Structures are given as C-alpha cells and as structure tokens.
Amino acid sequence: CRVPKARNPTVTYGKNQVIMLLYPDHPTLLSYRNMGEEPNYQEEWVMHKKEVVLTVPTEGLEVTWGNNEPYKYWPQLSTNGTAHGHPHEIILYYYELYPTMTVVVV
Amino acid sequence: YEHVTVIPNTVGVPYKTLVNRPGYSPMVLEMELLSVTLEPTLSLDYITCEYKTVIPSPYVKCCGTAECKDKNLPDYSCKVFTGVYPFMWGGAYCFCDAENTQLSEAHVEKSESCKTEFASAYRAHTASASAKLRVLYQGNNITVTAYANGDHAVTVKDAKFIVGPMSSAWTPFDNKIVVYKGDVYNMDYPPFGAGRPGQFGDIQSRTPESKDVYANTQLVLQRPAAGTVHVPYSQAPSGFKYWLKERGASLQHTAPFGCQIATNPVRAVNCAVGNMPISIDIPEAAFTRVVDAPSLTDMSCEVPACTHSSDFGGVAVIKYAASKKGKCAVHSMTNAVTIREAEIEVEGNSQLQISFSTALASAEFRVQVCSTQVHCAAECHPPKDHIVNYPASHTTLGVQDISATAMSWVQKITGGVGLVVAVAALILIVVLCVSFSRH
Amino acid sequence: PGQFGDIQSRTPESKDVYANTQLVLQRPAAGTVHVPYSQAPSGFKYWL
C-alpha cells in the first residue's frame, strides 16, 4: 500500500537542544528515543502545526517524523564562554560543557 | 605476524590500530564496522489470528422437543430454547404454536485469513552474532564478513581475519517475542492452550496449516427474538484485532542502543553495545624493514588552526627531511587526538599536512611517522554549531587531568597555598626544635 | 518559513517579493512524471 510522507520540519538548534516546527496535513505520529542504555521512548500524535522542543543527550537522540526516515542528532562541545583568557571566562567555559564536574571540582 | 586489537561496536566509525613489529617500519591499519547483526535462534510456540464463528441453520422442532449431543469442536456450545413460535415471510413456521423448541449450536474455527494475517509467538535463545568489517590494508580497501565468535576465520589478500567473541551478550530481544509482519514486540504471551477471551492468544494453533485449534471466546448462545429464527450469541471480539489496534511501538522504535530491528529473519542490526576483539594474521610481504624504509630527520610541527568540532576540525603541518622517496605510516601517540590519515608520502625536504580531531580545549600530542616522533601543540577553539548529524570522530574528554592549558592559575594558586603551608610548617618546626632543646 | 511574514512585499502591486518557504524538490518514483516537493505551508493562512 502507498503511504504519504510528512513535510520536512523546520529545524533550529540550541544548547543540547533541537527545536522542530511541524507541518502535518493529517494526524502524524512523532516519536523519539535516546541511543544509549535508556531509550526513554516517547511518542505523540500531532494534528496541527506545532513547535516541539527536544533535549539531546550526550549519546545522541533519534527522531522519527511520520513515515520519514529517522533523524539522528548529537551535541557539540560549544560554549558562550571560552578557554584561556580570564579565569572567569575559563570557569564559564568548563561550566557550560561539564556543569556537574565543574561544580564538584571547584 | 599476528596482530590483536579491540575496537568499539559502534558502527560507521573508523578506528586506527598500530602494528608494531620490531625490525620493521610501523604500519597503521584502519578498520570500520559497516554492519553488526545479532540474529537470535527462534522456536515457534504458536500462531495467533482472527477467529470465525460457525453457526449452522437452527433446527426448529415444533410440537415435539429438540435435543443435542456434545461435540469436540474447538469451542462448541449447544442450547435448546422452549416456547418458540417463529415466523417466515409467508406466515408461521408450522402448525402448532405451543410446546415448541429451537435447537441452536455454534463453534469457533480459525479464519481462512490466518494464512496471511497472523502473529507468530516465538521463544528466543542465543544469537549468532556476525559482522561486516572494512579494513584498509596496504592502502587498499577490503572487506570481510564473519561470525563474531572467535571462529570461522576468513582470509582475504592472504590475511586471515578472526572477529569476536562479542564482549557483551546483550540483545534487544527477550525470551518471548511476537512478530507481526515487519514488527517485533517483546511480550509475555500466554501458554499454548491457556489463552483468554478478548486478549491476544484467545485462539491458537501450532502452525498456520494445523487443524489443531484452541479457542476460548466465551461463546454463549442466547434466546432468539420472538417471531424470528435468528441465532443470537454473546462472544468476546477477537483478541487479535484488539491487539493490532493496541500494539503500541515495536522494538524498531523502542530498542536501547539505537538498535535497528528487521524481520525475515528476525535480527537486530548495529547495536552500539560493548566491543569486538579482532585478530589479523599479516603476511610478511606487508612489512618493510626499517633499513629499507625511508627515514626522516629534522622534523617539526605547527598547527595553523584547531577547532574541537568533532569532525576533524584540527589541521597540522609537519616539516620533514627525508632520506629518500617513499611512504610512511602516521599514528597518534595519544588517545585524546585522532589523525584522519593512516599514511603519508615523503620526498626530499618538504612538509606534510594532516587533519585531526580532539575533545581537548588545547591540543598537546605527539605524532609518530616512520621511525620518528614530533611533539605538536596548539590552542583549540569551540564550534559555533550546537548540533550535528554525525557521531564524534574523537573519544571522550575523560577524567579531569587533560584540561585546557593556560591553567597555570591552578598551579599558581595551589603553589601559593602550598608555599604558605610549607613556610608555616617550617616556622613551627624551628620553634619546636628550640623548645625541645630548652629544659 | 511557516510563520507570518514568510512572503513579503513593500506594496500589494510591487514586483519585489521576498520569499522563504524552504522549497525542496523531491525525486519522482514508480515511472510517474510528477514533480514532488517539500515546502512550508503559507504562514499567512496559519496566522489567520
């Protein structure tokens, strides 16, 4: 049987975050899983234009939109702070990348 | 020469292994998993499909009394109703309107559709894990396919490859699975012959073609409407149809470690779990003696740019003086920095350019080239982008110890505090020494 | 794309038109001669 493929979503990125704007014509299933030990599978049906914000773990996130082939996303070690320079710029750099270790070590 | 290394089971990621055979120039082999398949052994328990209810024309016996006998059909039920006075299109069924009875019977059979639309309940055991590996050997791209059990060696280009056993026995498939068409589900399906009405497995058979059918539909015959000959009943709707509507997500969408699930045969593909030992028997022809190999001197390294983008965002340029024209292997001496190129060409007095990937905020590493090493370092910048569609080519940062340079602030503070302690300790020691001598 | 102002012009009669619809052409299949594409729906209709 022939089945439709939902329109490509508009995608923007944030820190460890993927933001999608969905454009369904008809009810479309959206689902995603983590690619690590605990997939934390979640799914929802979307019957209208919607903005969905997904969190991306270190191991990466896989997202399936309708009948489209799945998308895979991985985070980069981006910062608003910087390495080197002033001591406070260095702490911000490491805090943003490793907020758990930074607090414990400091 | 037998070379043994271990690589991660992550698929689509190349790994570099350095072959070190004394007396010969160092060689680097590049290996990448293209596919890893975990194929479980299955044993069919039973088939679940839609049932059909069979109802033969009711026997209407007026004036006298009807009766029936027990039958051995899968879910047979029989009842006789009294006081019935049914009508047909042309008038009353028969002469007398009193002391009449109707005999109704019904049973359950597997639908003809069970040959096409059904779910198979399997028991799963161990998996015959196997993988397809890409190897860069002597500059050539070759592939092998073998079972990941440390056996079934495959020889290509006179090189014998042994893969496995797998470091992990983990599988996305549990002991009891159900396979609809292209979908596989993990569910504790009921024991054969113990199915329940309105639920998956309400009707069961060992094979699609079998005549041995179990059914539990709670089929109950009801009294017909007055003046009619129809046969009413109360029966639970097929549990197969309910299951199809309530299947939920299949393992293809819910499995851990990014496993891809395929059927016919049932298998898990490219699960990022554990690692895979690889043993290669390398022909002597593949080794060049250090006396025959090119030798490099007066080597130095600079880094025009470095970004820890996770995609070979670093570039390094190494100047060398070669004794003669030839090829040299290149390998990183640290796990923090990975070099994209496995080998380079050297001629006369020139420079080579290589790319690298690191998680380090500042790169400090040594690069090994044919019988020589050069120390190379530079500050690295963060990427502008937050998200990518590929896995990092480098390894993790690891335990703090590899943090950014220009960390002299840590040493200055630690040293400043340590110095204050050392001085205070000395002052106390001197006073204690004087106090000790005095009595 | 998909938002109010996805298509803009200074005046109703102007020939100077800005557009950002993320129009992507897709491959045809099964011997057909159609020209499939993926494009964000008008942000004007969505806004309305």
Add this chain to the structure above:
Amino acid sequence: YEHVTVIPNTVGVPYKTLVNRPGYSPMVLEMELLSVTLEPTLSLDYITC
C-alpha cells in the same frame, strides 16, 4: 558568521573593521556612508496664502 560593528554617522568618511573568525584568514571590510536621510512624517495643519 555574524559580524557586528558600530561606525560614526559622518558621511564621506570610510571606516575599516576586522573580521576575526578562528581557523580562517582574517578578513577586512571597508564601509563608508554615502548618504544618511532623516525623513520626518508630516501631517498638514493648514495652508496660508
């Protein structure tokens, strides 16, 4: 790469800015205002003659 600068509103005087994008050769742009117009919105009160 988004580069943000501020220049004086003096017209006919060129200003240069350096674009520093790590990993790439430094780029220099030159900007000059040729004209700046401040056009007030007016509402007519009356005509006298």
Add this chain to the structure above:
Amino acid sequence: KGETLTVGFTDSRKISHSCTHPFHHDPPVIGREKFHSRPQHGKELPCSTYVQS
C-alpha cells in the same frame, strides 16, 4: 468510515429493497500517518487485500 452498512437493489417491479445492519467500519492505520487517500508521492508498506479473482 461509518457505523452502519446498508445494501440494496432495485426489484423487477421498480421497487427499492435494502437491508441495514450495524457495523463499525474504521480501517487500521498503515504506517505512522493517518491519511484519507493515497498520495501521488510516498512510500510503500506491506498490507492485505482481497484479490479480484
């Protein structure tokens, strides 16, 4: 889609005959999208049909 099914025909006397019987009709979803008609462009998945033979 509907909740009832009606079938009928015209008689030799030009009299209409029909029979209405309750029936829940709501076909299963094939794939991950709910559509009301087959598209010009799309993907193909396994399904079951009745053969015209």
